[PDB]
Design a protein around this ligand. Structure first.
Ligand SMILES: *Cc1c(COP(=O)(O)O)cnc(C)c1O
Ligand SMILES: *Cc1c(COP(=O)(O)O)cnc(C)c1O
Lengths: 749, 749, 187
């Protein structure tokens, strides 16, 4: 358009491109330039088969064809270029060229030569300015056809808007020229962001909460892309996208099956519901990785035993509603959604897959049957909701979250009774970028457009997992390197199969004992680096490197690495990496064990804690800072307590609904960490990074059997003996003042 | 910076600017250009006193001074230029110039000559490249000083980011080069919007929910700008910014005083609370304008009578919590916040001003004592919350909403117990534009920077209200023009006084009888156009023009005009109007009564309803389309019913908490409009545009005394007898199928 | 900085440097020039292994890599160029280049190939102005890191000094514009 500088690749022979003796191909480059098109000229075939193969947004492609030369492989080069073109955006119009008889003698290659070409441009005989006008017609025809509906209407709303007076707000970025602060904001954010965030807007673009205009053609086109019967964009975040499907579902006394790998949004959505929950804590390994759930806790006897296990309120055997389970947990454990269906569909009438990092799951042949939208809807009535979080992984703007619904069986109920609870968690300011972005992140994956996109991010991740264990062929005398969590057969970029990436049942390359049958296919993008120091033999060996410092090294070097698990240095690859960022992570890990055997003072390489905290670790190397903190989980038995504090069922004395109204009442008071054993907590305390909600609001400590204090007192002496560090437990009310950084939590008097 | 093309005005004499014979002023323009600065040269004084006076973001100003010529008024011209410069951004460094003795003989003008100049540039003697380096030092010093804290850190985060690997999401706009749809999105939205919407981010920028980093220096700088003890940005919208202060306040059985001009967000926030409310319906005039509340319903006997008036649950006389009242209602009725304080502070311990359109209220001398942050905090404990909606009026990005808190008396409670309920309505995706924009909309108003900005929007509105009644001096034989709602003394741009804009008590230029003492100062920006057809004598005269068609005329001409009231054509001026858009609205209203006396067929000027709905009104003029619809409110007594249906207290049979869990239960069923008299409604139905929530969820109809059906059946025959029109009642479930657009509402069986 | 005209050596193949048919390496030379960088282009490997070997102050180095050709000695030429680079200033960020699969098949040369390279620049797929912005980020990062502490503070003291009045003496070379003898001394 006025934007959209999308090029047009021109391939022609080197004697007849950027050369002489009959030049209308340069003429139809120049006339396209006078239309306002870019030009990627190319002098040969294989130099064009690279630029067309890389992830361009290419409008047209102009190939040089001569037909009869198949042992000359010129027509064969044309059909190779066409095949490598139509893999990521197949609707781009490929044109041929030619001065004489061109495809008038094609012997048998016509299923992809004469079938995919959208016209021939006989450049001598035809009609040079109307020739390039035909090329520009097909180019801008496809360039208008590739935009999704909502974004097409929103880009043709900021050229032909409400003319002089769109009244409430900045009105198209007009109040941002009234002050120097505003004009600095203006020239930072661009113009088309301000001129497209309408404060209130109905007319031609269609309000979100009324589901009209082109927005209801962005929804229910996302249903045909992701796979659903009706989808709904949700803009106030995934911490409200869970809340919408919790709140349009049961909000009263009834029981709800929740897991205990939920985020801090799902218990918050329990509190807005008002329901007493039931918990299914998964088992973990001896490293810190939050493990998978047993499917034996999903049959119709285990949750019936859980019903009687509810201490405060005991429902009279409900059809236990609203099953939430974090599909694709933080370190890449994609569950079998179909094996949650076939194990659960009798007792649960509404399923809720918080597919937060499992955003790309509907666009590969690897996660088949494994995402809650691909379940092959049966006659039982399961109502699986899949509340995506597409501001991570599948790249939309921040807070953008779809919600995918598919019906079945006995409960449909989603015609209007869902919309009258969809309204009360979203604002009334529609028609803007986060709804427009969330229709580009569902139109970057139109058919094979995105299937060949997350196949590319495996090629950056399974050629990182190759070339990170492919430094173990270097000097590796006994065992000294980061143990990647694929140390067996799958070392290398061989094939992405749905049966060699599954964790083997009762194997010993994961540690989760008694894995059920074909359940937990690991995500080949969330490469789970285990730093050395915790053995698979049961307990710690004395060559540890701590969780923070291996991140804090490449923090200053300029990488961010997720952290959960005790030594589990989880790198998360995504679709938002430049091609060639495994090699920066390789280099800034091979630099880590090149400045750890040297064991330099921490102020020489880590100005995050040491050279800006220059008192405590003046002239102190990493290696003892490791090996004192490497023992500090051991002489406190806290790595034992990580096994202890997760596997316990905390004594549910208050529902999280009723453990929150005692916060506005005044019953929240400062109860310090010593006398906690026997007072009901009323604040969500999450050990973050290393896991789950430990204690919900309403999780009463019984006695010292509730052994969580071995980490609360571990976090205190971490921050006391060493500056800014793992004082990381979220919800810990740190009072500042007389004592030495002593902490306090909230409870109920 | 790399952006920020902020100019530098250069004023010098016409013999010695853009001329010859000693030219270092052009040299210090050229060296500033080699720094990367714009230049606004100016050949004379008064031509610079215009460009400096208009709303530029000006970095520096270079004036030509010669000192002794005060009757020559050259030094006097310098001090005029300095005074007109420092009115909207006073920290911009004004420099002088001069080749000889310059201000070495200033007689007595030194309080604004030698006081405001940040240096002299003796352009011959001084040090030409280091001279312009000093100018560029002060320029970029002020250009770094004018940015607010959070936006400064966010603009120095997208130049020196996390270097190679910021892992979750698009990672700085990198996944938007992987597809043609994504790359079209990329080249539309600019680069600095994608590269600044971080999906999750703690480190140098400071997470919102933890209130750390520079974000807690954006908050509590907004407290020193707006006036508060602690402010909180809220990003999920004002429909969640009300929900946060409702939800961190009482969420249980207790009683809550609510008005009945609330938006559809405030009853939704009742449902999340779970409380039984009490209602104070205001009285209106005979035009359709929603009128103001009586303050006699605020003393400690009227709400005590309201306590016994609660039909379902009767609390045992609580301190009635959480008073919500829409300060500055839709058509500009700014209340006296101090007279809500002095009338209410005994019985209510938490006040909640939904200052939605009252966003600019803290930055003038006109709304003093009239916004909930200016109340001069007393020893009673009122806790006034002011949940702004700054995506209208005071221009932030969409969904951006501050929340202003000030303490007092007996309840502070906002240290951490507010943050543990602020978390459960905002997402966990911080550090991005809507938090950054909401700190520019509180830094466009730093001191006198914004006080002289909404003083400008009065000058566009009180020079619209002048020059719209200043067409009544033209041919106006008896009475034929839009009656602006200021027809008395205040016609003209004379003065913005806080005692001639107040509605006079029991006057007759508004119609709200028995206005209390100095209560309701009208907003001079929300110009409330009344179209002719409803007389101030009591009932309709037969020269009406309908509400829609006067908007639908300039809808196609390209203006959007708000609508509430029966004939009340409310134009809302804002801060987001270009200077000179009153004259487009003047022209496209003087064109309305130039193609209404002509009374053309509606397909000739209105393709919204007629020329795209070409069956019903083929060859039908506006004037009878007026005068049939002008009588259609009269032969249905619906304009009578607008008085009737608001003034009734609907029979509260269910709390809106308990009238919403009977929607997921199944008790919502399709009850059509005929047999509604005696079944409890469970869906919020709002007549929008023309007013308030009529029936909440839980508002049972008693009998035909509940006379709302005179408008529900009016809206049916509106859409039946004439195509797309006022079928506008929000919540009306229109089934599509056999009958002629017959409607249905939801209830409880 | 405003000074420090430190170049950036660019090595690429003679068919694909100062030539045609896919040219983003010249684009990331031009954007670095618009940042204010010098460019030492080089058409071949051994002509770059001389200019990198002589005692330059080199900010970055951009090498052309293709990986599998070790008997072709192209990856071997890359690791020779890296080894001859990091001998007199080892912290200079060596970047690779490449249009397709580049070091995705490095057989056993990874102690000095994937270890010393501070990133790869896939010049077609990646993000051309932000690409050269990343190069200029690492370049000026190393260019700020190579200065010693006192000289770094003294070069960031004569850009953001005491603003208008540092009182005793010539005050930043200001009394050397008050006479012809002084101004001759000045220039
Ligand atoms: C990261 C994450 C989110 C993010 O939610 P927003 O509300 O989009 O910030 C939500 N749920 C889970 C499970 C997550 O891991
Ligand atoms: C327009 C308006 C809003 C807008 O709220 P969002 O949640 O920001 O869309 C809120 N409250 C009132 C009273 C309004 O008039």
């Amino acid at each position: 358009y006025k934007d959209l500088k999308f090029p047009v690749l021109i391939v022609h022979r080197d004697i007849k491109a950027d050369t002489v003796a009959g030049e209308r191909v340069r003429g139809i480059a120049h006339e396209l330039e006078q239309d306002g098109f870019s030009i990627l000229s190319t002098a040969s075939s294989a130099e064009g088969r690279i630029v067309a193969s890389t992830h361009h947004g290419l409008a047209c492609i102009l190939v040089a064809a001569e037909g009869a030369g198949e042992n000359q492989r010129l027509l064969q080069d044309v059909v190779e270029l066409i095949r490598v073109a139509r893999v990521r955006a197949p609707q781009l119009p490929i044109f041929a060229l030619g001065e004489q008889v061109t495809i008038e003698n094609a012997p048998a290659e016509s299923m992809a030569d004469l079938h995919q070409l959208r016209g021939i441009l006989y450049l001598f005989e035809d009609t040079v300015p109307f020739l390039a006008r035909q090329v520009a017609r097909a180019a801008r025809n496809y360039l208008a056809g590739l935009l999704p509906p909502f974004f097409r209407a929103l880009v043709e709303h900021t050229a032909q808007s409400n003319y002089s007076w769109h009244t409430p707000g900045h009105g198209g970025g007009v109040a941002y020229r009234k002050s120097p602060v505003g004009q600095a904001f203006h020239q930072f954010f661009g113009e088309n962001t301000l001129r497209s965030d309408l404060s209130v807007s109905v007319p031609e673009l269609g309000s979100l909460l009324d589901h009209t205009g082109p927005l209801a053609e962005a929804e229910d086109r996302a249903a045909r892309n992701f796979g659903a019967d009706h989808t709904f964009f949700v803009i106030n975040g995934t911490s409200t996208a869970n809340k919408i499907v919790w709140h349009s579902m049961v909000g009263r006394e009834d029981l709800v099956l929740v897991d205990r790998n939920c985020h801090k949004s799902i218990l918050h959505s329990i509190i807005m519901t008002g329901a007493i929950p039931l918990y299914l804590t998964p088992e973990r390994n001896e490293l810190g990785i939050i493990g998978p759930i047993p499917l034996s806790e999903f049959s119709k006897e285990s949750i019936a035993a859980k019903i009687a296990a509810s201490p405060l309120a005991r429902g009279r055997e409900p059809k236990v509603k609203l099953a939430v389970v974090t599909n694709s947990t933080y370190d890449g454990l994609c569950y079998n959604a179909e094996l949650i269906k076939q194990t659960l569909g009798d007792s649960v009438e509404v399923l809720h897959f918080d597919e937060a990092w499992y955003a790309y799951a509907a666009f590969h042949e690897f996660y088949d049957g494994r995402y809650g939208m691909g379940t092959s809807r049966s006659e039982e009535g399961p109502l699986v909701f899949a509340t995506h979080s597409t501001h991570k992984m599948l790249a939309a703007f921040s807070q953008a979250s779809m919600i995918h619904v598919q019906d079945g069986g006995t409960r449909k109920l989603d015609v209007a009774r869902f919309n009258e609870a969809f309204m009360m968690h979203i604002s009334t300011s529609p028609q803007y970028g986060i709804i427009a972005s969330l229709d580009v992140a569902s139109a970057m994956m139109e058919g094979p457009a995105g299937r060949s996109l997350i196949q590319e991010t495996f090629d950056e991740a399974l050629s990182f997992r190759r070339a990170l264990a492919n430094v173990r062929q270097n000097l590796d005398r006994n065992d000294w390197w980061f143990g990647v969590w694929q140390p067996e057969q799958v070392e290398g970029t061989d094939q992405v199969g749905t049966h060699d990436w599954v964790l083997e049942p009762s194997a010993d390359w994961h540690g989760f004992g008694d894995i059920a049958e074909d359940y937990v296919l690991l995500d080949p993008i969330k490469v789970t680096l285990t730093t050395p120091g915790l053995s698979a033999g049961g307990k710690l060996s004395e060559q540890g490197i701590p969780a923070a410092i291996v991140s804090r090294f490449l923090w200053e070097r300029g990488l961010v690495v997720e952290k959960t698990g005790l030594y589990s240095f989880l790198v998360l690859f995504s679709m938002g990496i430049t091609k060639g960022k495994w090699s920066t992570l390789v280099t800034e890990l091979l630099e880590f064990k090149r400045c750890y055997d040297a064991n330099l003072p921490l102020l020489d390489v880590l100005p995050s804690v040491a050279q800006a905290g220059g008192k405590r670790y003046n002239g102190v190397g990493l290696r003892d800072l490791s090996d004192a903190m490497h023992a500090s989980y051991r002489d406190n038995a806290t790595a034992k307590a990580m096994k202890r504090m997760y596997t316990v069922l905390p004594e549910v004395a208050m529902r999280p609904s009723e453990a929150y109204d005692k916060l506005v009442r005044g019953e929240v008071e400062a109860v310090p960490i010593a006398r906690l054993e026997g007072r009901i907590a009323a604040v969500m305390l999450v050990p973050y990074p290393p896991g789950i909600p430990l204690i919900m609001p309403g999780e009463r400590f019984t006695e010292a059997t509730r052994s969580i204090l071995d980490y609360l007192e571990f976090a205190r002496t971490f921050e006391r003996a060493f500056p800014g560090f793992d004082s990381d437990v979220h919800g810990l009310q740190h009072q500042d003042g007389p004592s030495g950084r002593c902490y306090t939590v909230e409870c109920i008097k």
